[PDB]
Amino acid sequence: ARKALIEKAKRTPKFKVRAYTRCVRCGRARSVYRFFGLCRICLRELAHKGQLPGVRKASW
C-alpha cells in the first residue's frame, strides 16, 4: 500500500472529511505543509537546492 495510496490522496471524493494532504514530490502523508504541498523532508531538499523562491536559511 503506497502506489494505490497516493491515488486516493488526489482522487478525493465521497465525504469531504475523508480527503487528506499528501506530499507531491514524495508520497508522505505526515508533516505535509499546506503552503508548499510538500513534506518536511522534500521541502528541506529543495530549499538547499535553491529551487524554492525566496526561501532562505533562518538565522537570528
Partner: protein
C-alpha cells in the same frame, strides 16, 4: 560527518536562486509543482546536453526558462528540430508563455554539476573510480580553478563493502561565506547498486 548544503548555505549572499518568482498563497503551491515538473521533464530529454542549471522566471503567464548547457549541440539551427515542438511540448499542461532560452556554459570543467555527471558516467562505464576522481580534479584544476574536491561514496567497483573515495587539490573552504563554491551531485546507476558523486568547485570572492 554532517555538513550543510553549500548552496543553501549561501543562497542570499553569493549564489542566487534557481527559480525566481513571487506569489502569495493559493498560487505558490500550484506554480511550484508546475515549476518542478518543468525541471523534471527537461532533465529527461535534455541530459545528452548535460545541463548545469535550469533557471526559471515568471511574471503572470510569462514563465521564462533558461537552460545552461556546456555544449548546446542539441538545439540545431531554428527549424532543424530539437527546439520547435520541444520547447512547445512544455505547454501541454501549462499553456503559458513557454519562453525557453539556451545558455552556453563556457568551461564545463568549472561547472560542478557537469563535473560530477562526467564522473558518474565513468562509474557506469566500469572505470577505475580512484583514477577517475584524480583526473577529474586535475581536469578542473587544469582549467584555472582555485580549488576542487570530488567525492564518490559506496560500493566502489562493486565488491561487497561500501567505500568512500576522496580527492581534493588546492583550496576548498566550505565554512566561509564569501566563497563562490559550486556544488554538484550525480547518481551512478550500476548493476550492483547506486552510488553518489559530490563535486566541489571553488573560486575567489571578497
Amino acid at each position: 560527518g554532517n555538513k550543510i548544503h553549500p548552496i543553501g548555505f549561501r543562497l542570499g549572499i553569493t549564489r542566487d536562486w534557481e527559480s525566481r518568482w513571487y506569489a502569495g498563497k493559493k498560487q505558490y503551491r500550484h506554480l511550484l509543482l508546475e515549476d518542478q515538473r518543468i525541471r523534471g521533464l527537461l532533465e529527461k530529454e535534455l541530459y545528452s546536453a548535460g545541463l548545469a542549471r535550469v533557471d526559471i522566471e515568471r511574471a503572470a503567464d510569462n514563465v521564462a526558462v533558461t537552460v545552461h548547457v556546456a555544449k548546446p549541440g542539441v538545439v540545431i539551427g531554428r527549424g532543424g528540430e530539437r527546439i520547435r515542438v520541444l520547447r512547445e511540448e512544455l505547454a501541454k499542461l501549462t499553456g503559458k508563455n513557454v519562453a525557453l532560452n539556451v545558455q552556453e556554459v563556457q568551461n564545463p570543467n568549472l561547472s560542478a554539476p557537469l563535473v560530477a555527471q562526467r564522473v558518474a558516467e565513468q562509474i557506469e562505464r566500469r572505470f577505475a573510480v580512484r583514477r577517475a576522481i584524480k583526473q577529474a580534479v586535475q581536469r578542473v584544476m587544469e582549467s584555472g580553478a582555485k580549488g576542487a574536491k570530488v567525492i564518490v561514496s559506496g560500493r566502489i567497483g562493486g565488491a561487497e563493502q561500501a567505500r568512500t573515495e576522496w580527492a581534493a587539490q588546492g583550496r576548498v573552504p566550505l565554512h566561509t561565506l564569501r566563497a563562490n563554491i559550486d556544488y554538484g551531485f550525480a547518481l551512478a546507476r550500476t548493476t550492483y547498486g547506486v552510488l553518489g558523486v559530490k563535486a566541489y568547485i571553488f573560486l575567489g570572492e571578497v
